[PDB]
Design a protein around this ligand. Structure first.
Ligand SMILES: [Mg+2]
Lengths: 49, 87, 49, 49, 49, 49
DNA sequence: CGCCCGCTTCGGGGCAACCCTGCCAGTCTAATACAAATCCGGCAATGGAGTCAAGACCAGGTTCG
DNA sequence: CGAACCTGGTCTTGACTCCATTGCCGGATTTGTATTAGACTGGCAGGGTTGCCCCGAAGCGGGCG
């Protein structure tokens, strides 16, 4: 996995910053852990998105 | 679509062809030639023992001896260990 | 109509509408090497992670 | 075993067959579904004699 | 119930696209708005892939 | 829009597409002519000095 | 004297977010008669393909005077 | 120093076996066609129910020649 980015999309992709690439790192459990600053860029809250 | 390509069987079959070509290249020229012409590796149409002896100048029975020897040789685990896992 | 009073999907109806080949299968396609999960916040990650 | 008019060049608005022959679309649907005849040709010399 | 991933699974019948939904494997719909985001980055190669 | 009506008068006029827009190259699988698909960047030679 | 240019009314087609998540729709004269097609099930034309068993032989390490 | 030995491949002969493979061959089934002689003589049928917009078409009032 190391140094191999992945594209993250939150549907719908309203504008250009709705797709953003991130270097992954493995995290236990089953949820995509997301940085707290890009939530405005995706317009993503955490109520089940 | 079950009729479509499984797309790992293709790379598996190509790797199987490569491993089988390596294992056949462990044999000699007469042995690998007899095996490839017996199973039709070169054309898809496997010629039989009389045609193989005709292209090898010998009897069909000599070819049967050679084919028995090569099937004895291939059944050794020294060749079988990297082919058993392909089924 | 077809059985059950269903209108038969003719040749033009494969291009018309959102169900046509253009907007359903030519522009937007389903992609392999994809994935989907519900997100959680990751306040120990760095911004590129 | 007998010719057929394309529905795209007849029924769409404006009717392209209708403009190409300067026929009204009511006349065109009256012709191409065998509801009314059309005088496809005429004579002049035998006509006046 | 919600997590999902597919590297290579089934494919559709008429067009040869991957399928959809967690019941099959399926891939995520890379729809039109994702395509506009990838164009707006200028990333042509990734859109081609 | 109007996939019927746009198509037929293009077919009447025998209008030839030029494959130089942006929605065209997305459809036919070529690289888009914007961002990393223009020939200012797509023909870069890289040699090690 | 009779005859057609702009409102005007009416038809009439196109389109109205993006992911998931599903998963299978029907009935009324009824029969014979036949000819051909075609399947199909089984001996017999093989005939060729495979198989066993013996053997011919060189010669090459291996055993002996 | 020279003579045999047993045994590897290498190949040959010839007989034996066994099974494809047509070829009939007779029968079974199955696919298509013809034929019914009292008299019968014009259909059932709901999706339509938006909103808005653009536009084509009819239609009439209006001045008009
Ligand atoms: Mg939310």
């Amino acid at each position: 996995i190391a140094e191999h980015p992945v594209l993250l999309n939150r549907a719908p992709t309203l504008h250009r910053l709705g797709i953003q690439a991130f270097e992954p790192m493995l995290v236990e459990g089953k949820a995509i852990q997301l940085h707290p600053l890009v939530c405005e860029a995706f317009n993503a809250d955490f109520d089940g998105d | 679509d079950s009729e479509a390509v499984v797309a790992v069987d293709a790379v598996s079959f190509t790797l199987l062809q490569d491993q089988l070509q390596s294992v056949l290249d462990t044999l000699s020229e007469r042995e690998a030639g007899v095996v490839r012409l017996r199973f039709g590796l070169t054309d898809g149409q496997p010629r039989t023992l009389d045609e193989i002896g005709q292209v090898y100048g010998v009897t069909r029975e000599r070819i049967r001896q050679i084919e028995s020897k090569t099937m004895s040789k291939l059944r050794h685990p020294s060749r079988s260990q990297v082919l058993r896992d392909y089924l | 109509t077809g059985p059950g009073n269903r209108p038969l999907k003719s040749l033009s109806d494969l291009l018309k509408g959102k169900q046509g080949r253009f907007r359903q299968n030519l522009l937007g396609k389903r992609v392999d090497y994809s994935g989907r999960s519900v997100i959680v916040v990751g306040p120990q990650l760095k911004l590129h992670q | 075993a007998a010719p057929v008019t394309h529905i795209w060049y007849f029924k769409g608005v404006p009717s392209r067959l209708g403009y190409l022959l300067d026929l009204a679309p009511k006349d065109l649907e009256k012709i191409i579904y065998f509801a009314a005849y059309v005088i496809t040709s005429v004579d002049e010399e035998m006509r006046h004699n | 119930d919600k997590i999902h991933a597919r590297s290579t699974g089934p494919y559709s019948m008429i067009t040869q696209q991957p399928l959809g939904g967690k019941a099959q494997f399926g891939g995520q719909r890379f729809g039109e708005m994702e395509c506009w985001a990838m164009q707006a980055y200028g990333a042509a190669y990734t859109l081609q892939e | 829009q109007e996939t019927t009506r746009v198509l037929t008068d293009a077919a009447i006029n025998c209008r030839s597409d030029k494959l130089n827009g942006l929605k065209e190259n997305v459809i036919i699988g070529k690289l888009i002519p914007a961002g990393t698909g223009i020939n200012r960047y797509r023909n870069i030679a890289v040699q090690p000095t």
